[PDB]
Coordinates of C-alpha atoms in Angstrom, one line a residue:
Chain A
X20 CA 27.4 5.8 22.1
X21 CA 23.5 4.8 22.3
X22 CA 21.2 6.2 25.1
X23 CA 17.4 6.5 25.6
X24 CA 16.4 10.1 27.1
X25 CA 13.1 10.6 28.7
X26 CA 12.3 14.3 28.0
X27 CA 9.6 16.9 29.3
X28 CA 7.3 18.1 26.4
X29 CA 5.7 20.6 28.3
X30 CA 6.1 22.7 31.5
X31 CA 5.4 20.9 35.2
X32 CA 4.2 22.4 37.6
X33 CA 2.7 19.8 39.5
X34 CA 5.6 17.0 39.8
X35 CA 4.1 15.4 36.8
X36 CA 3.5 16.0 32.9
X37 CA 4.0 15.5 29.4
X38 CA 7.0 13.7 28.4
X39 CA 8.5 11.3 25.8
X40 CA 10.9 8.7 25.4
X41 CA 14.0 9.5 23.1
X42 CA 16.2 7.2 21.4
X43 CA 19.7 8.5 20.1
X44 CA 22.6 6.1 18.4
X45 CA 25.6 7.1 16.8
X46 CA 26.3 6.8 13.0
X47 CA 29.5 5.0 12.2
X48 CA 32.1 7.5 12.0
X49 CA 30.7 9.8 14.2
X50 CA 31.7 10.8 17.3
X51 CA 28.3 12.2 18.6
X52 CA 24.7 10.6 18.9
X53 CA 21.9 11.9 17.5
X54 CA 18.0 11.5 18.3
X55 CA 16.7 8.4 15.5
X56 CA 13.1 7.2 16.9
X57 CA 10.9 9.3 19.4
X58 CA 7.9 7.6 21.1
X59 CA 5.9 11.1 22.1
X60 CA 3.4 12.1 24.6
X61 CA 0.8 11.3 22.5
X62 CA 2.2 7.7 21.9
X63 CA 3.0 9.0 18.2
X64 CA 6.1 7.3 17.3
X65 CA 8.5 9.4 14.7
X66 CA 11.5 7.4 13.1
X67 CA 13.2 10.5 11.9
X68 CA 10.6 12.5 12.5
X69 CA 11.1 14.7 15.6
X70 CA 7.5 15.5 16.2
X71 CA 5.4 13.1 14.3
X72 CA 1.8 13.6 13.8
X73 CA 1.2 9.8 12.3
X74 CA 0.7 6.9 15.0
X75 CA 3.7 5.5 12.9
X76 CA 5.9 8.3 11.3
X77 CA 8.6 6.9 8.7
X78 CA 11.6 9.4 7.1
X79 CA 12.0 6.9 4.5
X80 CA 10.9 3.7 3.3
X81 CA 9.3 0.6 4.3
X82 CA 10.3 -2.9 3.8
X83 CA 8.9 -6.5 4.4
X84 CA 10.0 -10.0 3.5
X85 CA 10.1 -11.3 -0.3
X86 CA 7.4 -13.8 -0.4
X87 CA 8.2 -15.0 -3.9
X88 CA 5.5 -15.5 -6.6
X89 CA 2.4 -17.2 -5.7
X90 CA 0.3 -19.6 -8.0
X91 CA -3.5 -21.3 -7.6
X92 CA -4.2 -23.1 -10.4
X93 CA -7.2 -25.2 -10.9
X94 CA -7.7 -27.0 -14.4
X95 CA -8.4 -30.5 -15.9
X96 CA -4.8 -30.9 -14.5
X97 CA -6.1 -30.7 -11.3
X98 CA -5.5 -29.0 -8.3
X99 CA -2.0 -26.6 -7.3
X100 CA -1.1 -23.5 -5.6
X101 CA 2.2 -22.1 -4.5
X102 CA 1.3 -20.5 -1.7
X103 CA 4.2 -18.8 1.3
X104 CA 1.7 -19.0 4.3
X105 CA -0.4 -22.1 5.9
X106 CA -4.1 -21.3 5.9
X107 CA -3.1 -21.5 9.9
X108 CA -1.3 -18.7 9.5
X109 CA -3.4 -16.6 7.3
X110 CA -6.3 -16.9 9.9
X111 CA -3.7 -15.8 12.9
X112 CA -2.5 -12.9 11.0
X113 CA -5.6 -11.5 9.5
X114 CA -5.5 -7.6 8.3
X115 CA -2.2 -7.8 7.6
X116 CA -1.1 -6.2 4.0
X117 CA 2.3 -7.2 2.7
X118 CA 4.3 -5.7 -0.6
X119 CA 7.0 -6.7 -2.4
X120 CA 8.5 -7.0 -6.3
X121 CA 8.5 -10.5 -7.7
X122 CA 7.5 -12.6 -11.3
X123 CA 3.4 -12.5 -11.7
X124 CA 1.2 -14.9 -10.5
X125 CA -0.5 -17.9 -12.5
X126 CA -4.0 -18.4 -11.8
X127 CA -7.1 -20.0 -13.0
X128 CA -9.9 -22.0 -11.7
X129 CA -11.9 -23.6 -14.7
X130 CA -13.4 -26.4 -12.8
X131 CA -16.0 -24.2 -10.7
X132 CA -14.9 -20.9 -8.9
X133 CA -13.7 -18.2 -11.9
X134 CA -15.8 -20.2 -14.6
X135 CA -18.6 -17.8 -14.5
X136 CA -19.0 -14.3 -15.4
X137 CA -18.0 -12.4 -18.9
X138 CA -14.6 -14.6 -19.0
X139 CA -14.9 -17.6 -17.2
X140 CA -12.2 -20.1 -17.0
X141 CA -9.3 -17.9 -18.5
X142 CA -5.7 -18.3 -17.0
X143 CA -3.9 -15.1 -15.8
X144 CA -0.4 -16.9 -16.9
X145 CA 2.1 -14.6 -15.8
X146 CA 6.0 -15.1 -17.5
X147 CA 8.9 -14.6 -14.8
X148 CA 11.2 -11.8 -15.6
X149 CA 13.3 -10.1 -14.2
X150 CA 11.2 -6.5 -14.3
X151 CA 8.2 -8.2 -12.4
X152 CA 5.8 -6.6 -10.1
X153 CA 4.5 -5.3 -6.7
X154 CA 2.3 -7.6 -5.1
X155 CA -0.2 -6.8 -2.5
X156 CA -1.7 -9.7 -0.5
X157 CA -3.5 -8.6 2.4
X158 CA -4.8 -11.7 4.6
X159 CA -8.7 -12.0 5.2
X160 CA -11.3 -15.5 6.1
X161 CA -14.2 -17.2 4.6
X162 CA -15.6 -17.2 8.4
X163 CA -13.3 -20.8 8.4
X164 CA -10.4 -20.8 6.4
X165 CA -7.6 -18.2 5.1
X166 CA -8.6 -16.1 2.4
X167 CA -6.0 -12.9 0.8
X168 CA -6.9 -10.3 -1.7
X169 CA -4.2 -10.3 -4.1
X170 CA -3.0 -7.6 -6.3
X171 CA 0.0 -7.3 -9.0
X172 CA 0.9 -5.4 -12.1
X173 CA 3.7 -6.1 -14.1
X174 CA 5.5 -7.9 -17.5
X175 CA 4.8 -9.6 -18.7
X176 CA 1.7 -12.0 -18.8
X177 CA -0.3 -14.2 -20.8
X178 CA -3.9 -14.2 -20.7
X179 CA -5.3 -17.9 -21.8
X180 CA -8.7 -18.9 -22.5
X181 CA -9.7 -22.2 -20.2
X182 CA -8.2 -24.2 -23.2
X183 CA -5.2 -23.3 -23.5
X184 CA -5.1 -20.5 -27.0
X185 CA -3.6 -17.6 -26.3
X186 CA -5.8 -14.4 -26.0
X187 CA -3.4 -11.7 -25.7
X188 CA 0.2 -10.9 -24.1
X189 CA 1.9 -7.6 -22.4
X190 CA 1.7 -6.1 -19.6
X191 CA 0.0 -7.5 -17.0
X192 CA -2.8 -6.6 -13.8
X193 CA -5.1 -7.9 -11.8
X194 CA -7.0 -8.5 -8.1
X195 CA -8.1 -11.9 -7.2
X196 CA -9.0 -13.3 -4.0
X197 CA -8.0 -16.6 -3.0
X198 CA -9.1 -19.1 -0.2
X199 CA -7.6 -22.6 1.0
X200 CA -10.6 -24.9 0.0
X201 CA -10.4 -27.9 2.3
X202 CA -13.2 -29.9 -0.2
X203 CA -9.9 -29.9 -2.8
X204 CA -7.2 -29.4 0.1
X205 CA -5.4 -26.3 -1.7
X206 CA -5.7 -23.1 -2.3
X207 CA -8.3 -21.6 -5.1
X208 CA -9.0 -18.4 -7.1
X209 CA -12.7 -17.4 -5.8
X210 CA -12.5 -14.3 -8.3
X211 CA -10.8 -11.8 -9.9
X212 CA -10.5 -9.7 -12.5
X213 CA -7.7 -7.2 -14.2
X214 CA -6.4 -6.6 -18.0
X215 CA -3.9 -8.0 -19.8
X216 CA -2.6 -4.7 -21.9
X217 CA -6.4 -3.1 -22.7
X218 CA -8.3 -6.3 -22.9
X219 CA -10.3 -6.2 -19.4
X220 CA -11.5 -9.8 -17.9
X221 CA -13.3 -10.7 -15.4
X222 CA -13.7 -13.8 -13.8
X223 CA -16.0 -15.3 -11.1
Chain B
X29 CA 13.6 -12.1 30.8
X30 CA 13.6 -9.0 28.8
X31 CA 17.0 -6.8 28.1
X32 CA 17.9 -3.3 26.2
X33 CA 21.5 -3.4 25.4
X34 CA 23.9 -0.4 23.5
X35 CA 25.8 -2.5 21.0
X36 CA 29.1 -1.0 19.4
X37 CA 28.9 -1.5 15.5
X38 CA 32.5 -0.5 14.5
X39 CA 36.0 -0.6 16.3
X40 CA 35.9 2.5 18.8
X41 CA 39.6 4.1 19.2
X42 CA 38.1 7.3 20.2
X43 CA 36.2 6.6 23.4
X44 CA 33.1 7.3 21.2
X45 CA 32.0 5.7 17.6
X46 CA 28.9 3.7 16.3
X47 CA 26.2 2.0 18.3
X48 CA 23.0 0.7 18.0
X49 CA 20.3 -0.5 20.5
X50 CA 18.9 -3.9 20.3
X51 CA 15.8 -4.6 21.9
X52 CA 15.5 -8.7 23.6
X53 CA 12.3 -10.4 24.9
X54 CA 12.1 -13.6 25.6
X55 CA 9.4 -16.2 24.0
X56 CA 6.8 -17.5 26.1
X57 CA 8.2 -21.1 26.5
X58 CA 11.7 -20.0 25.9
X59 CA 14.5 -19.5 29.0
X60 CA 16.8 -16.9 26.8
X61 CA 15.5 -13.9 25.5
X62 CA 16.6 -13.3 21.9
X63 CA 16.9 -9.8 19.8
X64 CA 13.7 -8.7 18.4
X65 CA 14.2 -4.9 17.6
X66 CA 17.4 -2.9 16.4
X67 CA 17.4 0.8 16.0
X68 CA 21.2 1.1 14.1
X69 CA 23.4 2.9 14.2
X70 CA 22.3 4.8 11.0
X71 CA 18.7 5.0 12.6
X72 CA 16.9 2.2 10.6
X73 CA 14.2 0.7 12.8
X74 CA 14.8 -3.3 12.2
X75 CA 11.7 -5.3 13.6
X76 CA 13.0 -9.3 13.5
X77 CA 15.9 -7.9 11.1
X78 CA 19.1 -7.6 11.9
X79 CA 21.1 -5.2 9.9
X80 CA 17.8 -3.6 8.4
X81 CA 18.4 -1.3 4.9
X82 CA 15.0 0.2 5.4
X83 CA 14.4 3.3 8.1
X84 CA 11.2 0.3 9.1
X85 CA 12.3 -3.1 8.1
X86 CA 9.5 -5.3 9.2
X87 CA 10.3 -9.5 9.3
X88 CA 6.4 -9.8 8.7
X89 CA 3.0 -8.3 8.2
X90 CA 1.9 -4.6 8.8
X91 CA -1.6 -4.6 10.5
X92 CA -3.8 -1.4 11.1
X93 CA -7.3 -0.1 12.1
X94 CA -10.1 -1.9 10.8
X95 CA -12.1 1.3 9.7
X96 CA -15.4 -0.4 7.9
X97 CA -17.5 0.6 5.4
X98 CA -16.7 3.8 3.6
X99 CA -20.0 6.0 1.7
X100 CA -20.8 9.1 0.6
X101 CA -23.8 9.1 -1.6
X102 CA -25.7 12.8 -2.6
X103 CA -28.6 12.0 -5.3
X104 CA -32.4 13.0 -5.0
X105 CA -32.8 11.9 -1.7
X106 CA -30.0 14.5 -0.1
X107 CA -26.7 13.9 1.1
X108 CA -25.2 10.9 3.2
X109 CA -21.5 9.8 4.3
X110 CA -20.4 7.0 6.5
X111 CA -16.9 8.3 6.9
X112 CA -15.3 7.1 10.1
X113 CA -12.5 10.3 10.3
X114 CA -13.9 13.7 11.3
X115 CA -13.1 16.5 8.8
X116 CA -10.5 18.1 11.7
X117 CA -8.9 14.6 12.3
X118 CA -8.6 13.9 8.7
X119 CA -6.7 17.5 8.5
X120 CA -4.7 17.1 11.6
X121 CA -3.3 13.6 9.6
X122 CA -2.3 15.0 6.6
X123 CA -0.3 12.1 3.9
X124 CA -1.6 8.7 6.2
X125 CA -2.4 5.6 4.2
X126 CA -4.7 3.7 5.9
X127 CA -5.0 -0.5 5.0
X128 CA -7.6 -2.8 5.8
X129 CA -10.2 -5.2 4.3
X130 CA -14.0 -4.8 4.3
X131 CA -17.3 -4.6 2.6
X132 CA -17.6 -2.2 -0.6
X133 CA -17.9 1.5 -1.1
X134 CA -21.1 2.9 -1.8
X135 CA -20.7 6.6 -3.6
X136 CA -22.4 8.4 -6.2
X137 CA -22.8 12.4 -6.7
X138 CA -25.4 12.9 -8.8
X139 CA -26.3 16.2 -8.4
X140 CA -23.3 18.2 -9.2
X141 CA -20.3 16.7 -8.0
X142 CA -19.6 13.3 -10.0
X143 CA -22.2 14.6 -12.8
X144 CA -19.9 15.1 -15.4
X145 CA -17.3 13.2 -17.6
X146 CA -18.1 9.9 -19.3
X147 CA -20.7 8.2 -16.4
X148 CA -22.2 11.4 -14.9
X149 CA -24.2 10.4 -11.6
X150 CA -23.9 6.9 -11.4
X151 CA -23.5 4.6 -8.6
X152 CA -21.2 2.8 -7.3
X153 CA -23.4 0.4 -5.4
X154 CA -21.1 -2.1 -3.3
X155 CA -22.6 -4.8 -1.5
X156 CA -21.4 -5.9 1.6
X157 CA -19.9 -9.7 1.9
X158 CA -18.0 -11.8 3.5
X159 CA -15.4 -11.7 1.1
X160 CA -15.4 -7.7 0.8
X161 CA -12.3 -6.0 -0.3
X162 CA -9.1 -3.8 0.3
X163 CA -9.5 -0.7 1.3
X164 CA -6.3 2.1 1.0
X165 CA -7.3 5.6 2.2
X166 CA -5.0 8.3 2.1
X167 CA -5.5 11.9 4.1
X168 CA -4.9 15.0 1.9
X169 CA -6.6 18.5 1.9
X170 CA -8.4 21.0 -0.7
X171 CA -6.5 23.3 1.2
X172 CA -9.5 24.3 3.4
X173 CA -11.1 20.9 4.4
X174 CA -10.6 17.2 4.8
X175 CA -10.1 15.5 1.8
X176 CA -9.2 11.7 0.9
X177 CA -8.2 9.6 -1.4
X178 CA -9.9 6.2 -1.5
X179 CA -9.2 3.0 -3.4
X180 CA -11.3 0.0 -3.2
X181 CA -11.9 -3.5 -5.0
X182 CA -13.5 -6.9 -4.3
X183 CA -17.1 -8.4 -3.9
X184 CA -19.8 -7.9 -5.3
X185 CA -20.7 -4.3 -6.9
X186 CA -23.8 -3.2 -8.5
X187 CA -23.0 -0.4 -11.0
X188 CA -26.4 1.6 -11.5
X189 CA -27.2 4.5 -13.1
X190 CA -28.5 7.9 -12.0
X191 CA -32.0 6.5 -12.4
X192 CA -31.1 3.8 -10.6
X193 CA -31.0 1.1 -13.1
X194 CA -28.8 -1.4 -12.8
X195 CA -26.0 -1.2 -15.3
X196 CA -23.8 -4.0 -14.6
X197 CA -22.7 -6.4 -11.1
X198 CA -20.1 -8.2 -10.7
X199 CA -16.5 -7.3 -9.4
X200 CA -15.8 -3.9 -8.6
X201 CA -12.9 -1.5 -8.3
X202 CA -13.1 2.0 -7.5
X203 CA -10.1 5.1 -7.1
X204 CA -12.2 7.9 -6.0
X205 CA -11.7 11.3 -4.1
X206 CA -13.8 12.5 -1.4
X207 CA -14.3 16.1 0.4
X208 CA -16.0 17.6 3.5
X209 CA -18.0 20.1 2.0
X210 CA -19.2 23.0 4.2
X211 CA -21.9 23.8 2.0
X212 CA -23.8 20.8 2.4
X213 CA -22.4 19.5 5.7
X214 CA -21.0 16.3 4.9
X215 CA -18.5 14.6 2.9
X216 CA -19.0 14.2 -1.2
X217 CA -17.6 12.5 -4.6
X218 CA -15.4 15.0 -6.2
X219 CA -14.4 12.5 -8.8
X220 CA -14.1 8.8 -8.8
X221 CA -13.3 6.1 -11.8
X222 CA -12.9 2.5 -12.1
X223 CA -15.0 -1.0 -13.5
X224 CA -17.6 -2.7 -13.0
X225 CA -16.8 -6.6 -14.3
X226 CA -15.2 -5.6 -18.0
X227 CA -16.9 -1.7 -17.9
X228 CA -14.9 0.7 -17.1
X229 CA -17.1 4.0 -15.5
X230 CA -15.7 7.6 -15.5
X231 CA -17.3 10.9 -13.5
X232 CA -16.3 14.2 -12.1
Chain C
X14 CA 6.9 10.9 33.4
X15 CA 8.2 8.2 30.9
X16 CA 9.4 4.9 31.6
X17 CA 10.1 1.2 30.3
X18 CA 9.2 -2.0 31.9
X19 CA 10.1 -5.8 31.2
X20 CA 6.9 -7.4 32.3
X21 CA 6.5 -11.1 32.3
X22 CA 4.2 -12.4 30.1
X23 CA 3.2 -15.8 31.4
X24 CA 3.9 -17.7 34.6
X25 CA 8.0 -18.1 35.6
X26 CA 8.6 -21.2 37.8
X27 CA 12.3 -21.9 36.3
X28 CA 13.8 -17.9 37.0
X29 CA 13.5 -17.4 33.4
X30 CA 10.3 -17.3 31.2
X31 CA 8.5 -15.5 28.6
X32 CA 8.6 -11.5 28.8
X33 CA 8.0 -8.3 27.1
X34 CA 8.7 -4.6 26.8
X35 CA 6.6 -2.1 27.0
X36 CA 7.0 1.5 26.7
X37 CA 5.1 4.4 28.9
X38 CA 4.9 8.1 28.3
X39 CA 1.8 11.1 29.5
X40 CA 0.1 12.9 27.0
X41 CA 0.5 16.4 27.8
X42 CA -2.0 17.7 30.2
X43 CA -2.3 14.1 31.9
X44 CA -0.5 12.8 35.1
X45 CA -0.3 9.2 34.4
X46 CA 1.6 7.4 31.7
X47 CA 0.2 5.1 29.6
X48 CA 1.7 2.5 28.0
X49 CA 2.2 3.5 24.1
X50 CA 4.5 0.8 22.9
X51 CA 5.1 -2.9 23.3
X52 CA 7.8 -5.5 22.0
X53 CA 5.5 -9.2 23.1
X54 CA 7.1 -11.9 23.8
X55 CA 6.8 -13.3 20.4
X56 CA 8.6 -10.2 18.6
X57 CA 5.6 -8.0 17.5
X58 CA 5.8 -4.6 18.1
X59 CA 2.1 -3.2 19.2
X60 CA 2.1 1.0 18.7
X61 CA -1.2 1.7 20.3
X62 CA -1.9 -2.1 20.5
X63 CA -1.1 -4.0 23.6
X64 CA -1.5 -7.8 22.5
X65 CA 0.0 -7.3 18.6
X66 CA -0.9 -9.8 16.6
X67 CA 1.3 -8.8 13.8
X68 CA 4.9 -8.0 13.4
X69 CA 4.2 -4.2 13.1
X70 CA 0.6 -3.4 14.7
X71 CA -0.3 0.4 14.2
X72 CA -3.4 1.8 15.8
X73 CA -3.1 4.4 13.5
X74 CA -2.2 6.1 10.3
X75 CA 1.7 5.5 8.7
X76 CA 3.1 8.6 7.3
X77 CA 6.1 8.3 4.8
X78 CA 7.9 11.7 3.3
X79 CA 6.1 13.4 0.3
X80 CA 8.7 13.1 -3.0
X81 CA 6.9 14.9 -5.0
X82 CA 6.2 14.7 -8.6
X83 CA 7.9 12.2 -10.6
X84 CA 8.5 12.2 -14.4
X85 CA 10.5 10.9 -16.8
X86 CA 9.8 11.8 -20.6
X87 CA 11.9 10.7 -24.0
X88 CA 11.0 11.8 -27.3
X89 CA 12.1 14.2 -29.3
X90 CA 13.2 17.2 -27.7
X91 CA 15.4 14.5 -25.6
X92 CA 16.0 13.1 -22.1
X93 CA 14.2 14.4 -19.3
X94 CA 13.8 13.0 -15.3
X95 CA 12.6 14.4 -12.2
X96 CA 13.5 11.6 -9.8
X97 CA 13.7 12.1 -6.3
X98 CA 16.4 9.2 -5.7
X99 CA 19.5 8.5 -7.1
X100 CA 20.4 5.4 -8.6
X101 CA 22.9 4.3 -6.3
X102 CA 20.1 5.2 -3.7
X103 CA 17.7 3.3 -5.1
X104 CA 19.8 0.3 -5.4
X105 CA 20.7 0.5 -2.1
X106 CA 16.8 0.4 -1.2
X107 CA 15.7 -2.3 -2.6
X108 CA 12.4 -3.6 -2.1
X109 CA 11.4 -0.5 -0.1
X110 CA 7.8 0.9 -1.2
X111 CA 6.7 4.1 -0.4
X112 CA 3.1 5.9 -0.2
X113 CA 2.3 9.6 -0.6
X114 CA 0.2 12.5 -2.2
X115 CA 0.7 14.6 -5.0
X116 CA 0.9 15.8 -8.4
X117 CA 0.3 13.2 -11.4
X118 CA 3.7 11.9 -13.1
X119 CA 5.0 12.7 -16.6
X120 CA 5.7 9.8 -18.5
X121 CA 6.8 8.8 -22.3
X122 CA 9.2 7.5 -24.3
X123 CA 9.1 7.5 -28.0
X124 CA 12.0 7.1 -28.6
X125 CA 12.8 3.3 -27.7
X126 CA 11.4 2.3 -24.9
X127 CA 7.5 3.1 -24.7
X128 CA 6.8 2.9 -28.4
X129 CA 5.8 -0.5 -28.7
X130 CA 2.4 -2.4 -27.6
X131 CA -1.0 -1.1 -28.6
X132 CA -0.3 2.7 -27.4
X133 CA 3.2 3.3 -28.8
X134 CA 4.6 6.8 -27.9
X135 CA 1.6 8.3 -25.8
X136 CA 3.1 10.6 -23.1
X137 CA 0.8 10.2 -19.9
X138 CA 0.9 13.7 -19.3
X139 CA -0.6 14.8 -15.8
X140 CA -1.8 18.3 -14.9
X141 CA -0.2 19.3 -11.2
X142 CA -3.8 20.1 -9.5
X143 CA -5.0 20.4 -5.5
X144 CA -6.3 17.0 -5.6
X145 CA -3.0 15.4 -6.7
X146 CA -3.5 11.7 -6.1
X147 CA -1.4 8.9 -4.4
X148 CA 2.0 7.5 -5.3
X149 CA 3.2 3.9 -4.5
X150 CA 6.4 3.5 -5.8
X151 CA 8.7 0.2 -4.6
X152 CA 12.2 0.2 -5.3
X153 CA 13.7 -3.0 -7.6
X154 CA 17.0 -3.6 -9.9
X155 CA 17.4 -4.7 -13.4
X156 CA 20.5 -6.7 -11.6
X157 CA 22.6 -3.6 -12.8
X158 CA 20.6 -0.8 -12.0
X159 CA 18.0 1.2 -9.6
X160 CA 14.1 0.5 -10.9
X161 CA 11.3 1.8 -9.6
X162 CA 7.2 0.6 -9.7
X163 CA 5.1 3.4 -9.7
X164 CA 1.5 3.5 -9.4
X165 CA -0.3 6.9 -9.6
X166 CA -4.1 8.2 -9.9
X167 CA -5.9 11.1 -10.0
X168 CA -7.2 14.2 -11.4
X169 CA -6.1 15.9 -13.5
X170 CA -4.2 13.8 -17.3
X171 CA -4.2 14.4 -20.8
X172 CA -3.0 11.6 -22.8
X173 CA -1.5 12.2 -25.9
X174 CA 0.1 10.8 -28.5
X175 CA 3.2 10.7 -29.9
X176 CA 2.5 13.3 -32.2
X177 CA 1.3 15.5 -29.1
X178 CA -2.5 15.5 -30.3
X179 CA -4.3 15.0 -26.9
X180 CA -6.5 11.9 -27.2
X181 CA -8.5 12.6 -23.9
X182 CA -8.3 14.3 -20.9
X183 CA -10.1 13.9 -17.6
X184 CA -9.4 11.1 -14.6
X185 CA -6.0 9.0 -15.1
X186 CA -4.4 6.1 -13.8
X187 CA -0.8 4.6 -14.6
X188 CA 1.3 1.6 -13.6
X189 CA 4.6 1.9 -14.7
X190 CA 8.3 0.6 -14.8
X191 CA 11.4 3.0 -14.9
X192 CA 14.9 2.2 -14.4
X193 CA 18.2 4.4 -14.7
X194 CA 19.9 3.8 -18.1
X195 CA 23.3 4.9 -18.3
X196 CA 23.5 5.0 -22.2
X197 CA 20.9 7.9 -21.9
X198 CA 22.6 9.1 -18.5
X199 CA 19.0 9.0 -17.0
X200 CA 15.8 7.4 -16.0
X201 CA 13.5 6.2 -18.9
X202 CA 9.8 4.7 -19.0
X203 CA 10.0 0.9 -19.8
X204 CA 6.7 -0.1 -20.3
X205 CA 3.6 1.4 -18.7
X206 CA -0.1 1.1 -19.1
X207 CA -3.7 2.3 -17.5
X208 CA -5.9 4.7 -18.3
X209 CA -7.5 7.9 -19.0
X210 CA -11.2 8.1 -18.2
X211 CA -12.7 5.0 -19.7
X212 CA -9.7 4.2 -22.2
X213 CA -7.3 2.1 -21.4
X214 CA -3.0 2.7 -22.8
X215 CA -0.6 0.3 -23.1
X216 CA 2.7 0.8 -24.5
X217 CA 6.2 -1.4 -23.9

C-alpha cells in the first residue's frame, strides 16, 4: 500500500492552518506503510527526515549520472576534448554541480591558454584505473559559450612538460576551468592548477 | 496530462505488500505523460530513475542558490564581512552544503585571528571575474555562534601580505573557517589555508 | 490546507498536452498555501523554485546525516577502522557521495599499503576539535569490494611519521582512497596525499 496524507502541523482554530503533505509506501515484505518523504509547512522537504530543517533533507546518500572521464587537449597535435555535454547544454544548465568516480582527466593547452604562468604548457596526463577519482564539474559561461570548473583527485597521473618528458607520477589533483572555444570549435583548458604527488603546478 | 499512481512492486497475497508512487507529467509537445519521479518502496527518492539505489537518485544536475561573493576581512582598518546568512540562520541550518559559482573570496585576519601559523595576516585578495570560481559552504557552530566552513578556487587571486604587498597572483584556492564573533560584531577568519599559483599559505 | 494540482503547462488544443505537478502546503501561522514543490513538464523537480531549470533545483541548503569520524590506521600495533558503512553497504551504494561536518580522519598504513611514494608511512593524524571540518566521501568498488574517496580539512592534524615523530602540526588537508580488504578483515588506506600547513604528503 502507498498513500499521500495531508496532515495538520499545528492547531486551527480558524478553518485554516499549518499543514504538510505526507508520503508513506510500503517496503517489500511488509505489511504496513510507513511515512518516506515529507513536504512541510515550511516547504522543507525531508526524505527520511520527519521534520527536516534543510530546504532538501537526505537520510542517506546522493547520486547522479556517471559522466565518464573528460579530456581537452590542445597541443602541436591539435585540437580534442571529450567532453559529455554540448556547449548548448552547459549554457541551459548553468549552476549545476555534478559528482561522480571515474579515470582522471587529460589536459593541456600549449598552444595559447595554460602556456603562461610558473608551468606553462604541462599536460595533466591522467592513467585510467580502476581506483580513479571524484569529479566535480559545475557548469558556468564566458558571457557566450559553456564554461565548467572542473575538479578531480585520484591515481594515478602523469604530469608532462609541453614536450612530452615526464616530470613526475602518483597521485594526482587538480581544478581547471574549461570553455568551448568556437575560434578552434572544441573545448579548451583556460587554467588550472593542482599537484601531482607534492610537486604544485600552475598553469594559465 | 499529469498522473500520481500507487504501483505494487512485489506479488501481494496478503491484501497488503510493497508499493511505490510514481509521479507522471507530461512533456510540453508530448500527448502521454511519462514517469518522472518514484518514491519506492524502500523510500529512495528516484528523480528520472527508475529503480533508484540512492535515498536522492538524480538523472541530472543539482542546482542551488547563487549566494555571491563571500568576505570577511579585519586588518588596520577594522572589521568587514559580506556574508549573505545571518548568524541565527546559519545556526538554525546546521550541516547544509551550499554550491555555486562566483567571484573570489576576499579574507584576511590580521589582527588576531589568522595571525599565527606559517603566513600570519595575510590576504587572500580575490578578484572578481567573469570566470570566478566554486564556492562549497557548509553551516556548523562553535557551539555558541554561526560558524562556516568555506572552500573556494578559480580566477584570479592576489596573495598580499599584512603590509599589503603583493606576494604572489595568479590562481587561487582557499579552505578557510569563518565565525560570527560577538565581540566585534561581525564575522572573522579563524583559520584558513590554501595556494596562491605554486605557494601554498598557512594561518590561524 | 495542503493540496496537489496538475496544471497545464502550455496551451492543449488536442485533449492532451504538456503538464506539471505542483505541490501546496501553509506555513504555520499563514492561511493560504503556497506552492513548495513542482515536477515541470520536462521532469525537473523545483523545491522552492517554480520554473526548475535543473533536474533537482533547491532553493536552499541539502542536509545529508553526520557519520562521524572516520579512520583507518595499519602499522604496527595492527588493524584498526572506524567506518560508518559496511562493505556490503557500501557496495550496494555505489557512486553515492556524501557531505558533512566533523572531526578530522585517522589515516596510515605502514604496513603495505601507504608506505610507498615520497611520504611512506606518515599517519595523518587529526585532533577531534569544535571546528571539525567537512567530509565528502563517494562510495566506489575495486570490482570486488566497497571503496570509499574521502576528502577532509580542517583544524586541528599532526602528521607524523612512521616512526611516530610528529613532523608538523597545525591546518590539514587529505584526499584519500580506502577500500575493505578481507585478508586484513578491514578497511586500509591505499594511497593518500595533501597537506599539513604548507607541506604537502604523499604516500601510495
Amino acid at each position: 500500500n502507498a498513500s499521500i496524507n495531508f496532515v495538520a502541523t499545528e492547531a486551527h482554530t480558524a478553518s485554516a492552518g499549518g499543514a504538510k503533505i505526507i508520503f508513506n509506501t510500503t517496503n517489500n515484505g511488509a505489511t504496513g506503510s510507513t511515512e518516506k518523504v515529507v513536504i512541510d509547512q515550511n516547504g522543507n522537504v525531508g526524505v527520511g527526515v520527519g521534520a527536516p530543517t534543510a530546504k532538501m533533507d537526505v537520510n542517506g546518500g546522493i547520486k547522479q549520472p556517471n559522466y565518464g572521464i573528460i579530456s581537452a587537449v590542445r597541443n602541436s597535435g591539435g585540437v580534442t576534448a571529450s567532453m559529455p555535454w554540448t556547449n548548448a547544454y552547459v549554457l541551459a544548465h548553468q549552476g549545476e554541480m555534478h559528482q561522480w568516480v571515474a579515470g582522471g582527466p587529460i589536459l593541456q593547452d600549449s598552444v595559447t591558454g595554460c602556456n603562461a604562468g610558473p608551468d606553462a604548457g604541462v599536460k595533466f596526463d591522467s592513467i585510467a584505473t580502476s581506483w580513479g577519482g571524484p569529479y566535480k564539474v559545475i557548469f558556468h559561461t564566458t558571457g557566450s559559450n559553456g564554461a565548467i570548473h572542473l575538479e578531480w583527485s585520484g591515481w594515478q597521473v602523469s604530469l608532462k612538460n609541453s614536450a612530452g618528458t615526464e616530470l613526475a607520477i602518483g597521485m594526482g589533483q587538480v581544478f581547471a576551468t574549461l570553455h568551448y572555444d568556437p575560434a578552434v570549435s572544441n573545448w579548451r583548458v583556460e587554467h588550472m592548477f593542482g599537484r601531482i604527488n607534492n610537486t604544485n603546478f600552475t598553469c594559465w
